Amino acid sequence: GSSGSSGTNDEETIQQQILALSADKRNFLRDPPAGVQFNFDFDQMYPVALVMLQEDELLSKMRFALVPKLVKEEVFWRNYFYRVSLIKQSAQLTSGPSSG
């Protein structure tokens, strides 16, 4: 039984990347600049993050010891996602041909 072809977009990895973040603390502290228009709504992505915790013990066990240890539960959920959205978006952004 061999396996070479996949087909489905690069979504199987998107999750693998979002995991590497949990194993990092510099990300929780690091925050995006102003120029970048990242309209993030905590209260909105507040609960949705709870589901990512249970699944990812590292993301929880850490956040707890890294918050407010590091940043406010809110901010933490802000910087964290920020990087995430970039990973997921890429999947598409990198459609193929580059123009402009």
From Swiss-Prot:
Subcellular localization(s) per the UniProt record: Cytoplasm, Perinuclear region; Golgi apparatus; Perikaryon; Cell projection, Axon
Subunit structure, as described in the record: Interacts (via phosphorylated form and BSD domain) with AKT1; this interaction is enhanced in a mTORC2-mediated manner in response to epidermal growth factor (EGF) stimulation and activates AKT1.
BSD domain: residues covered: 36-88
Record's function text: Plays a role in adipocyte differentiation by promoting mTORC2-mediated phosphorylation of AKT1 at 'Ser-473' after growth factor stimulation.
Tissue: Expressed in heart, placenta, lung, liver, skeletal muscle, kidney and pancreas.
Disulfide bonds: none
Post-translational modification: Phosphorylated. Phosphorylation increases in a mTORC2-mediated manner in response to epidermal growth factor (EGF) stimulation.
Organism: Homo sapiens
Name this polypeptide is given: Synapse-associated protein 1
Part of the intact protein present: 130 to 216 of 352
